[PDB]
Amino acid sequence: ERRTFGSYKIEEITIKIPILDDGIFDLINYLLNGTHFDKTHYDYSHLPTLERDFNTASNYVSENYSIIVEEIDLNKSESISLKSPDFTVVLEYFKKVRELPLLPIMCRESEDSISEDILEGEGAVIQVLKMFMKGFLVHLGENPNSYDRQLTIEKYRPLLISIIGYEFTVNHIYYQLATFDNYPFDLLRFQLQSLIDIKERIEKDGLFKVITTTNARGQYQSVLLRGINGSESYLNLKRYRKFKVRVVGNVDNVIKNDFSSLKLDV
Amino acid sequence: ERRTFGSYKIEEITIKIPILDDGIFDLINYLLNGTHFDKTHYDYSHLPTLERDFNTASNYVSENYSIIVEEIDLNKSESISLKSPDFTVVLEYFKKVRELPLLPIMCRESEDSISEDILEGEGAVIQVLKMFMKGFLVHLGENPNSYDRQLTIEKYRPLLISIIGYEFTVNHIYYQLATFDNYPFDLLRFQLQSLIDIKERIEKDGLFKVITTTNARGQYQSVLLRGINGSESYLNLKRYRKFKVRVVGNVDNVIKNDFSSLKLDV
Amino acid sequence: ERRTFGSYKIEEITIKIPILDDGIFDLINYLLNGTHFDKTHYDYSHLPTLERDFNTASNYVSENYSIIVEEIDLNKSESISLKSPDFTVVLEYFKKVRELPLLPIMCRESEDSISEDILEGEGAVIQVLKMFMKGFLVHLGENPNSYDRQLTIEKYRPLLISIIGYEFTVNHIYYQLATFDNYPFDLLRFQLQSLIDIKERIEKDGLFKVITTTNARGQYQSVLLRGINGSESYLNLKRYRKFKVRVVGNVDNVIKNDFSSLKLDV
Amino acid sequence: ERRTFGSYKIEEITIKIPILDDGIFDLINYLLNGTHFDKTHYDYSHLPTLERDFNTASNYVSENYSIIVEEIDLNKSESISLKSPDFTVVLEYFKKVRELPLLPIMCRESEDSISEDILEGEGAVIQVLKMFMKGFLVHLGENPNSYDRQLTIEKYRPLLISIIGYEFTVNHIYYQLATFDNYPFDLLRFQLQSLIDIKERIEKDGLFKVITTTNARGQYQSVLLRGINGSESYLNLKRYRKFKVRVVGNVDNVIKNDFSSLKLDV
């Protein structure tokens, strides 16, 4: 049941709306367990250390997830969610509700205080997700679709955000890619090339803005990304699911048969 | 937009029930206009005179349909329907309701009184539909499906009925095929072979029974086919439709592009 | 209130749909108590040791059921259910929810470690159910019905599965019988004979497949039987009930009377 | 599709209420057409001239019905209804509403003015219906039912009324039978014998009463029968229908087969 890495899938519904399969839910869940690429749902020549870095990040995410797995009840669905710009995962577990900030880059006054092995773990993680996005876009170019003009990249925004955030906290392409989550596929397929210009000054002084609302019952902090267009965007949650693939097998071994052989009457 | 002759198609719906595309509605409609196989929605080596007999029958059905087309109003949907055993088509036309018995074989006391050219027209028609069913079943054998165990032949019953009716009014396979409209596909795919045994006596004395109910508002005649199992079946209407294929085109000319070529950052 | 062994019954409902009576719910319940054939709801000449093996299996199932009966509360309906391929029963009990795997054949690394008396108990059980199915099919042949073309064998699939599973873990007929749970009655009545052909190679390497879905809240294992058609099928639950027969007695002793005897006026 | 004369049938419905089939709707409809007993839905030794008188009455009713059939439109369901004590039938006919008093005995000041052939026609009719009721009751005695205690004779009241009306206008049994339309079947089956006593005086002075209500929009006449109990009853309409028997045939010719003959594995 393998599939190419960085993939997407397209599903039909009608009473003919299409929907996208992410390639995200599975990646997160695999990273939870430290599963290695060999025993994964996933021809990667131009992907150096794809399994190598992949498994390193799998391991790193595995212990990090275990860090909060310890407190979890045995008894206490799965609706994983992500938040920009520290790129935090969100989980729940019921009887029959926590988070973990995988890549906190908002504020880190421990540049040398944080050990270098941990730093390498994050660097592997970000490399994995970045070239993951690269594979996703090359896959986009590979096999187009009727519905290429029907949906947008909007899912993948925060990952690009984390990309450029690290880049500045160590580009134009990934930046402007993030700039328009509403941007459509076949568009990129046509004009991926010249998307280059703000030039220096709106990002020399912080890539993003932070504003907190004193809602008198809490302090709703919020991040406002800044785009090459010279604009801003609210960062927002996007809870995920994963479609429950049904249990159908395959015709694979069915014995096809001839009919002229049978003495059909005429 | 060609397709193989005698074809079927499989469509998914969910809130994953499959549905069948007949290869019947289109055939009837084509036969209405006398359209020739060249300009039809349809690799036919083992199908002798397929286009030849096909177009002969197209012509014959075209005039026959015109016989009642004349009375039709300009102004006065399409929900074509069929009745066994004289294999009659049923039409309607509204402002914004008739029939024609294509192959009346119940009673014909004009064996030589009916002209031989008309007889040849019907013989071409029945040959066309018979080898049509042959193509349908060979197509069944060709490409199986997950859903081969989910539906039955029930649509095609009356055609087989007409087949054997002509045969007797000039076999075991087509007969027993008709005998169980509820019969499933992949079943036939497995045990098409030995379906041979009633032996002579229930069909020497008429293949079918006729019973009329004096409903005091009419005389509902009805035909009761007799099957190799030694049983009977009510013959019933089955109104047809045809799914309205949407207007989507194709990725056909889309320019796929490379990505390692673009100076992606890493 | 006796009935023939391996029986079935047919019931009408309308606002004229028929329904089947299994001969399964009762068999299971009888086997629960170790009840002997004499004091059962059940002319068995061709059924050697029918009561003998029947009562042996009744005893074996009785202790096996008692094995989990012990934990049951006094206070804590009946909706018995079965699962292939280890052929497990499923029970519940409420105040006003367990199982037992009668014939676990999926994995048994105790071929000589399991005592021979237990093995004989299972062998008696499987013999009982197998010739039970034999009686069911001979009964099918005996008295046909209007509705023989209206339903399928689908209920009895897992039992046949267990049959062939034991056979391989010690045939074509019972195998192919299982292969199409959707297979219709009067069909079998006609073509029971030649249903023989995969030939060796798809079953030399395991009769079935096992696939588990890591649903992130559990590990849904599932079994995928392989059929002579060269295909697969999901194994599925089928919860049972039993119709509550009403309390009507009989005209049995009613005194029929003459009327010409009474001095009717004319 | 024959059945015994004067018959009844019992049908089940549940969400196990039984319903009765009359043997009345059919009799009326047959009498409408003058159909003869040979070509009717109907072992009559104790029924002298059953077909003879039956066909005489069939003829008489046929012309009488034709008397009003003449005015009927071609275009202008069937819900035949009956009224005591002149025992009048009630019909309707729509595009997609009359009556006829078969046996007017309320007032006839033409005792010799009415021709004797017409009189013989009515006498045949009344004999037919009377011994019809006789057959119905002997059939009741013949085959009892679980539901014999669930319904009453109420349908057949007016016919008995006409019987005794003629008798007086030329008994105890048929009289008292009519007296309690609510009377139950198996009751009669037990105590048919001694139902004999008003003695002369309430019927010497008219068997019935007539009362008309001047409803200021019409004159609703009504008849009030008098019973051996010394009581009265309103005479009332009872519109009829007839259940639409479905089109199912028969297993009649099905080939039952052996199973020990087939080389079943064990």
Author numbering:
A (entry chain E), B (entry chain D), C (entry chain C), D (entry chain B): 5 to 19, 44 to 70, 74 to 107, 111 to 130, 155 to 228, 238 to 264, 269 to 337
Sentences from the paper on this structure:
The P9-1 protein from MRCV (hereafter, P9-1) localizes in viroplasms of plant and insect hosts and, when expressed alone, self-interacts giving rise to cytoplasmic viroplasm-like structures (VLS). Using an integrative structural approach, the C-arm was found to be dispensable for P9-1 dimer assembly but essential for the formation of pentamers and hexamers of dimers (decamers and dodecamers), which favored RNA binding. The multimeric structures of P9-1, resembling the ring-like shape of hexameric helicases, and its ATPase and RNA binding activities suggest that this protein participates in the equimolar copackaging of the viral genome.
The global resolutions for each species were 4.7 Å (decamer) and 6.8 Å (dodecamer) based on the “gold standard” criterion (Fourier shell correlation [FSC] = 0.143), with local resolutions ranging from 2.5 to 4.5 Å (decamer) and from 5.5 to 9.5 Å (dodecamer). The doughnut-shaped P9-1 structures reveal dimensions of 12.5 nm × 12.5 nm × 8.5 nm and 14.0 nm × 14.0 nm × 8.5 nm in the decameric and dodecameric assemblies, respectively. The full-length dimers are settled in a parallel mode related by the respective 5-fold and 6-fold rotational symmetry axes holding their C-arm protrusions as staplers, as previously reported for the octameric arrangement of the RBSDV P9-1 crystal structure. In this way, the C-arm of subunit A interacts with the neighboring (−1) dimer, while the C-arm of subunit B interacts with the other-side (+1) dimer. We found a marked ability of P9-1 to bind phosphate moieties in the three multimeric states, with a strong preference for the decamer. Remarkably, a significant binding probability was found on top and around the C-arm region, which was again enhanced in the decameric form. In this regard, the crowding effect within the pore that takes place in the decamer would promote the interaction between both sites, as additional and stronger phosphate binding sites were predicted by in silico simulations.
